[PDB]
RNA sequence: CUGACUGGGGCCUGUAGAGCACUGAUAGGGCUAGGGGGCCCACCAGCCUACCAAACCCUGUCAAACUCCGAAGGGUCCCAG
RNA sequence: AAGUCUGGGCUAAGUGGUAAAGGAUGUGGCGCCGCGAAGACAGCCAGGAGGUGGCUUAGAAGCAGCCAUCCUUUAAAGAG
RNA sequence: CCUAAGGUAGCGAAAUUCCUUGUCGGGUAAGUUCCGACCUGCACGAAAAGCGUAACGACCGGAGCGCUGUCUCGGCGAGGG
RNA sequence: CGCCUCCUAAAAGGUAACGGAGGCGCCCAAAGGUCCCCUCAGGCGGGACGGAAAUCCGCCGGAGAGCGCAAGGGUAGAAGG
RNA sequence: CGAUCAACGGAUAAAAGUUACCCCGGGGAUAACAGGCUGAUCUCCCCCGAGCGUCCACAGCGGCGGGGAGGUUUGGCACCUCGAUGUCGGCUCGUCGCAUCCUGGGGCUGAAGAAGGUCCCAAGGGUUGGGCUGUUCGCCCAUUAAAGCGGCACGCGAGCUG
RNA sequence: AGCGCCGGCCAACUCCGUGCCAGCAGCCGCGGUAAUACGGAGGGCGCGAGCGUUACCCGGAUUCACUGGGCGUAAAGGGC
RNA sequence: UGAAACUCAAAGGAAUUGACGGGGGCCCGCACAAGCGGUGGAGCAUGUGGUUUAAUUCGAAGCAACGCGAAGAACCUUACCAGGCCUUGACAUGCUAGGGAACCCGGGUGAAAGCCUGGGGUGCCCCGCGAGGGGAGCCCUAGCACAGGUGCUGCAUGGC
RNA sequence: GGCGACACACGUGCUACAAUGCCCACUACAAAGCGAUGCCACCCGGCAACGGGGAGCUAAUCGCAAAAAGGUGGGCCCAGUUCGGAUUGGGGUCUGCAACCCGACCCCAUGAAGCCGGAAUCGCUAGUAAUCGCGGAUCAGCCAUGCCGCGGUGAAUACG
RNA sequence: CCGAGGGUAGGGCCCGUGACUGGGGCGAAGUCGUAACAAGGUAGCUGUACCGGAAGGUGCGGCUGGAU
RNA sequence: GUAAAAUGCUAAU
RNA sequence: GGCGCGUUAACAAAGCGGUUAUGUAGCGGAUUGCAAAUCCGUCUAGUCCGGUUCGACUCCGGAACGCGCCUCCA
């Protein structure tokens, strides 16, 4: 939560080459805000455009109390300006999306052998006297979920039991790595959506030198300072609105 | 008459045990290179630490391929039964 | 086949006559301090209180976790 | 990077799939078999032919109707012993 | 799978296991013979370039160096230079 | 003088495989089944009491470690049997153990009642029918007071099946 | 005394708010900080115990053409 | 032989003026060619991006932004930043209250600004030799209407 | 205080890398402008920047004024040098209230890069290019090597 | 006898629905190339055939709705 | 019969 | 489990007892209205532990991870 390090995913939205540039503009704005808050940034995955932008940049903000501040940036950011890609001096409206997520654990996986039942029995197929009378085949049952692995690959019960336990764990692991990805997904779609011109959280209107956070109504005119990092005025204005969002019925 | 076995006497040995002098291991303490941290400074060095610890020292130990030591026995020759 | 042989002791579990960590007012024999008619130990008969609690906590206010356990009438009363 | 060149069409958990009773659908009250699909094909593949194909089969799977001493679960009778 | 070294091996010699650890299948014309001469590793201090360590000086230092190559024995009163 | 005759006391100057088409002579000197010894593995029961359980170590639990029992599993060993000890599962027929699935009798409970949990005593009797697969095992359907776990050459082929 | 409408078609316009949001929409389109096109207000236009909408039929549609259409290149001559 | 759902607000024909062509033709320009000196490398000057900064004011952006606005940044310039003052204000008009001033020398205190200060001297008609009483430049405090803004929009504009 | 920051990157220029050159001495020929808290002749002190004197001129009259390349004479001898003049130390001059950030200039010392510049790229067709000095605006002084001007000397080549 | 209808068995047509699968329409931004419109940088288009990630390419024959 | 080195540029009257 | 092979920078991938590998990318410039393509330049390394050697990415020994093969007669 609020106190833990967090990860900011900046993707480009509607706009094409111009969105990937505005996404670069959002990316410098956020690194320079971290330096102001004495935070620490490291990039994890960046997809650049030869024009100078990024289709995607993913970076961490290391420091005590990161998810407390950046969490207000998740949403669709709208830019309206004359693009450096435009030739006929027109104003285009383009969008970039920002997803903010707390850095989690890479927690290690192991088997609780008290919720696991191991069955042994005779195997199938060839072997003569051996296969007839030897308990080589192994079934391992994960008791809470019911999923089972069986193994009679070798002639030895201990070898088949070890190999069976390996597959069971590796299987339970992927079940766990998939539910986590399903939650990581529905959460990202909760913050980013389709990245449409609507769905906007903030407008950066370069002609009017205006930045507007339509969630609260706040607007400054220091669009140069906002783009250079000085976001602290806006954050507080939401932090205030957050407390006045907590008004006991 | 030289035999097994036995009495005396000389010489050879590195085990049991023990030990730490060598080769290694080793707990804690002292002292004390170097590192971590470290208040501070890079104009130049200092200072701090109930951090990790080289060497050295103290107490306490470990070893088939460690021995400053070291039996009981064993081997061999001589003389005698 | 030859002692229901003699003398001293232990065991009550048929232990003897099939086993360990560990547990035990089993029983017998030694020790070592301690308290005792400055009336001890056991029971009984009293008192065993007061500032009333320091953190935590809507009460945890003698009678939760945490922080230390000052003192009065004294023959004594721990904020237990 | 390497090879002489890197498996084409078509087919695929198969007379081939180890993990495997893969997964999804169908059938059943319930289906490790069956049929239809999917394709990370351990280890299909083009005359040791590939994929289909009406008709044929004392070949080998799966299902239904009919009917039953196969069975619930056994009883009685006959004749040769 | 032959050969060498150490241990196991129970203090003479010898002694097994698909027991524990290593090495050999070369080399040297001097790394051989003799005579003569010389003595290490390491530590502290000192010294342009020059450092942990190149060469030079002092003091301490019995052998922990060296002995082509594995290990053991041996060894400066030399087998070392 | 010519040897990785290195399988290094060196068969020839000169040499690889396959047999489920197989064969003879031998061995329980030696493997596969079962027994035996052992019990690492397996199953069961304890000791310790850190900690969980709002509170409270012990209702129910038991970190790190410790001690055993059993002789169902997988092994180790190679002791009777290789002039033969027929090997999976099913069927049929049982019998025994008890570490008890149900039924009977109890103690504790974080037991209001009903219903459970946990441990103790108890082996008299009981412990169903079906779908899948050769299966043992397991899953599933429908019930049940319950749908126990083991030994008997993994009981039982001069009893059947195959 | 109410209901529809006032960008064009189509009769009836100005001010504030909003700022591709909120919304309008029968078609062409409106709205991205000076909107007669969104919402309100004033003002206007049309009907009036009614005003609008939705559905459906004919019309406009000579757009199934008898009245009253077409086929070189727009859809349209059959390969002969 | 020959549909439908769904969907679009058009799909089309010919012709016009353009623009474009790695179409043609005919022309031209230091456009190439033909020449001569350079730039790109070096050191400095200057402008700029970027980084940095409390601030490093802002505008200029291919040719046609970059010794450009700037034909002169130590202060001033100066629009930026830090700290100290200012409240009809540095300036404009007009209206009411205390004054009634105009102007010129000083005093503290402060970095200065500013704040608190202490000396004095007026016009016009007059009632006038009256105490002096008014109209009376201008000046200062109470209030006003107000000013001030290099704050934004060169995509609302003029001018250049 | 900043606008003058400095790991870096680009544009415009200046100065060079040398002998058809550098140096010293002496000796010539311009044009355009500017000049009253203004230009400064001339004289002295100072190596010099400058200072103190101090004529003349609202200026075809007095001054800024040396033009520079050029010429004659002598020197350097092919070297990172008598080429180059960056960087830094020290001692001073002037403006200005005030030169730390952050001015210009003078003298002494220090004497860096640089040996003609990769891919690439700019200008110029005649008094042009190149080379050489001069003045002005702004302006207290100046970071001007910039701008706008002015004359001196004076080419190569254009088939197409 | 016929006979409502009930039952048995086999056909026809229609509607809904189905693991999976085939393309189609739409989209103010994505990935790969650039086939077509200029001789579109290999004139295009065409029926058919074979091939290729994709547009497409190539063979055979046809068309001009092709350039100079 | 001729005779091309060279790909691309989203989205706001 | 046995046996063989391997670990190198951003990626893929080599040689070598003493020593800028290489290609593509990345970075600075050039060219273009801009991007690509193209052109001039530029460069970061040897998994861990222990030995040998004057010297180890390179040789020996072990660890960890990956790949290939085998695991048969009951
Ligand atoms: K066989
Ligand atoms: Mg991406
Ligand atoms: Mg464009
Ligand atoms: Mg178990
Ligand atoms: Mg088996
Ligand atoms: Mg089978
Ligand atoms: Mg077989
Ligand atoms: Mg078979
Ligand atoms: Mg067995
Ligand atoms: Mg004798
Ligand atoms: Mg003798
Ligand atoms: Mg001993
Ligand atoms: Mg020792
Ligand atoms: Mg010992
Ligand atoms: Mg010893
Ligand atoms: Mg002694
Ligand atoms: Mg003796
Ligand atoms: Mg003797
Ligand atoms: Mg004798
Ligand atoms: Mg008696
Ligand atoms: Mg007696
Ligand atoms: Mg008893
Ligand atoms: Mg007994
Ligand atoms: Mg007993
Ligand atoms: Mg006792
Ligand atoms: Mg294959
Ligand atoms: Mg192929
Ligand atoms: Mg094919
Ligand atoms: Mg295929
Ligand atoms: Mg398949
Ligand atoms: Mg299947
Ligand atoms: Mg198949
Ligand atoms: Mg196969
Ligand atoms: Mg399978
Ligand atoms: Mg299988
Ligand atoms: Mg299944
Ligand atoms: Mg199924
Ligand atoms: Mg089903
Ligand atoms: Mg079946
Ligand atoms: Mg199938
Ligand atoms: Mg698969
Ligand atoms: Mg085949
Ligand atoms: Mg094959
Ligand atoms: Mg073939
Ligand atoms: Mg063949
Ligand atoms: Mg073939
Ligand atoms: Mg087939
Ligand atoms: Mg057919
Ligand atoms: Mg068939
Ligand atoms: Mg058929
Ligand atoms: Mg047949
Ligand atoms: Mg047949
Ligand atoms: Mg036949
Ligand atoms: Mg059937
Ligand atoms: Mg049936
Ligand atoms: Mg039937
Ligand atoms: Mg019968
Ligand atoms: Mg009968
Ligand atoms: Mg009969
Ligand atoms: Mg031999
Ligand atoms: Mg040998
Ligand atoms: Mg011995
Ligand atoms: Mg020995
Ligand atoms: Mg001995
Ligand atoms: Mg001997
Ligand atoms: Mg041996
Ligand atoms: Mg031997
Ligand atoms: Mg060897
Ligand atoms: Mg020698
Ligand atoms: Mg020698
Ligand atoms: Mg000699
Ligand atoms: Mg020494
Ligand atoms: Mg020294
Ligand atoms: Mg030294
Ligand atoms: Mg030695
Ligand atoms: Mg040596
Ligand atoms: Mg060696
Ligand atoms: Mg050999
Ligand atoms: Mg041999
Ligand atoms: Mg041989
Ligand atoms: Mg021998
Ligand atoms: Mg021979
Ligand atoms: Mg021969
Ligand atoms: Mg041979
Ligand atoms: Mg043979
Ligand atoms: Mg065969
Ligand atoms: Mg066969
Ligand atoms: Mg035969
Ligand atoms: Mg055969
Ligand atoms: Mg035969
Ligand atoms: Mg035989
Ligand atoms: Mg025989
Ligand atoms: Mg033998
Ligand atoms: Mg025997
Ligand atoms: Mg056996
Ligand atoms: Mg065995
Ligand atoms: Mg056996
Ligand atoms: Mg066996
Ligand atoms: Mg048996
Ligand atoms: Mg056995
Ligand atoms: Mg037996
Ligand atoms: Mg046991
Ligand atoms: Mg036992
Ligand atoms: Mg055990
Ligand atoms: Mg027990
Ligand atoms: Mg607790
Ligand atoms: Mg309790
Ligand atoms: Mg446990
Ligand atoms: Mg134990
Ligand atoms: Mg035991
Ligand atoms: Mg047994
Ligand atoms: Mg058994
Ligand atoms: Mg056994
Ligand atoms: Mg035996
Ligand atoms: Mg034996
Ligand atoms: Mg046998
Ligand atoms: Mg017999
Ligand atoms: Mg017999
Ligand atoms: Mg027999
Ligand atoms: Mg028999
Ligand atoms: Mg039984
Ligand atoms: Mg019991
Ligand atoms: Mg009961
Ligand atoms: Mg009971
Ligand atoms: Mg009850
Ligand atoms: Mg109970
Ligand atoms: Mg019973
Ligand atoms: Mg059942
Ligand atoms: Mg059935
Ligand atoms: Mg069945
Ligand atoms: Mg079954
Ligand atoms: Mg099974
Ligand atoms: Mg019950
Ligand atoms: Mg039940
Ligand atoms: Mg059984
Ligand atoms: Mg059996
Ligand atoms: Mg049987
Ligand atoms: Mg039989
Ligand atoms: Mg049987
Ligand atoms: Mg039998
Ligand atoms: Mg029999
Ligand atoms: Mg029998
Ligand atoms: Mg059979
Ligand atoms: Mg059969
Ligand atoms: Mg209307
Ligand atoms: Mg109307
Ligand atoms: Mg109208
Ligand atoms: Mg107004
Ligand atoms: Mg409306
Ligand atoms: Mg309408
Ligand atoms: Mg907007
Ligand atoms: Mg507005
Ligand atoms: Mg507008
Ligand atoms: Mg409006
Ligand atoms: Mg509207
Ligand atoms: Mg309307
Ligand atoms: Mg309106
Ligand atoms: Mg009409
Ligand atoms: Mg009509
Ligand atoms: Mg109609
Ligand atoms: Mg008609
Ligand atoms: Mg018509
Ligand atoms: Mg015709
Ligand atoms: Mg036609
Ligand atoms: Mg036809
Ligand atoms: Mg047309
Ligand atoms: Mg044209
Ligand atoms: Mg040229
Ligand atoms: Mg040049
Ligand atoms: Mg240059
Ligand atoms: Mg330059
Ligand atoms: Mg800047
Ligand atoms: Mg502006
Ligand atoms: Mg320019
Ligand atoms: Mg300026
Ligand atoms: Mg300037
Ligand atoms: Mg200023
Ligand atoms: Mg100022
Ligand atoms: Mg304009
Ligand atoms: Mg602008
Ligand atoms: Mg204008
Ligand atoms: Mg500036
Ligand atoms: Mg440069
Ligand atoms: Mg310049
Ligand atoms: Mg330059
Ligand atoms: Mg002058
Ligand atoms: Mg020099
Ligand atoms: Mg040089
Ligand atoms: Mg020089
Ligand atoms: Mg100086
Ligand atoms: Mg300055
Ligand atoms: Mg030179
Ligand atoms: Mg010209
Ligand atoms: Mg000048
Ligand atoms: Mg000036
Ligand atoms: Mg009928
Ligand atoms: Mg009918
Ligand atoms: Mg194309
Ligand atoms: Mg084409
Ligand atoms: Mg093109
Ligand atoms: Mg092309
Ligand atoms: Mg083409
Ligand atoms: Mg074709
Ligand atoms: Mg082709
Ligand atoms: Mg061509
Ligand atoms: Mg290309
Ligand atoms: Mg593209
Ligand atoms: Mg495109
Ligand atoms: Mg192009
Ligand atoms: Mg466009
Ligand atoms: Mg390598
Ligand atoms: Mg790699
Ligand atoms: Mg290579
Ligand atoms: Mg580059
Ligand atoms: Mg570029
Ligand atoms: Mg490279
Ligand atoms: Mg080394
Ligand atoms: Mg090493
Ligand atoms: Mg190296
Ligand atoms: Mg290695
Ligand atoms: Mg075989």
Burial A164-197 (b: 16+ CB within 10 A, else e): bbeebbeebeeeeeeeeeeeeeeebeebbeebee
Structure method: X-ray
Is nucleic acid strand G under 7 Å from A78's C-beta? Answer: yes
CA distance A29 to A160: 57
Stated resolution in angstroms: 2.7
What residues are paired with A150 via a beta bridge? Answer: A139
Is nucleic acid strand G under 7 Å from A220's C-beta? Answer: no
Residue A203 C-alpha to ligand 157 middle, in angstroms? 27
Question: What sections of chain A are H helices per DSSP?
Answer: 17-36, 67-70, 129-133, 157-192, 223-228, 232-243
What residues are paired with A220 via a beta bridge? Answer: A211
Is nucleic acid strand H under 7 Å from A91's C-beta? Answer: yes
CA distance A136 to A145: 25
Residue A15 C-alpha to ligand 207 middle, in angstroms? 15
Closest CA to A213 of A97, A73, A28, A101: A73
Q: Is A248 helix (H, G, I), strand (E, B) or coil?
A: coil
Number of Cβ within 10 Å of residue A13's Cβ equals 25
Q: Which residue is nearest to nucleotide K9 (CA to C1')?
A: A85
Residue A134 C-alpha to ligand 111 middle, in angstroms? 15
CA distance A80 to A93: 4
Is A161 exposed, middle or buried, given 0-12, 13-18 or 19+ CB atoms closer than 10 A? middle
């Amino acid at each position: 939560m609020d106190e833990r390090d967090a990860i900011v995913e900046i993707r480009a939205g509607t706009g094409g080459e111009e969105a990937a540039l505005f996404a670069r503009d959002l990316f410098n704005m956020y690194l320079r805000f971290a330096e102001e808050m004495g935070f620490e940034t490291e990039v994890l995955d960046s997809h650049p455009t030869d024009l100078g932008g990024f289709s995607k940049v993913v970076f961490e903000v290391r420091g005590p109390g990161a998810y407390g501040t950046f969490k207000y940036e998740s949403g669709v950011h709208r830019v309206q300006r004359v693009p450096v890609t435009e030739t006929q001096g027109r104003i285009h409206t383009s969008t970039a999306t920002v997803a903010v997520l707390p850095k989690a654990e890479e927690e290690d996986f192991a088997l609780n052998m008290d919720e696991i039942r191991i069955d042994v029995m005779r195997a199938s197929g060839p072997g003569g006297q051996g296969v007839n009378t030897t308990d080589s085949a192994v079934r391992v049952v994960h008791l809470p979920t019911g999923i089972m692995v069986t193994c009679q690959d070798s002639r030895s019960q201990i070898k088949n039991r070890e190999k069976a336990l390996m597959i069971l764990r590796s299987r339970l692991l992927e079940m766990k790595r998939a539910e986590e990805a399903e939650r990581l997904r529905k959460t990202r779609l909760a913050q980013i959506g389709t990245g449409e011109r609507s769905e906007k959280i903030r407008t950066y209107n370069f002609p009017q030198s205006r930045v507007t956070d339509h969630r609260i109504g706040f607007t400054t005119h220091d669009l140069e300072g906002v783009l250079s990092g000085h976001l602290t005025p806006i954050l507080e204005a939401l932090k205030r609105a957050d407390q006045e969002r907590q008004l006991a019925a």
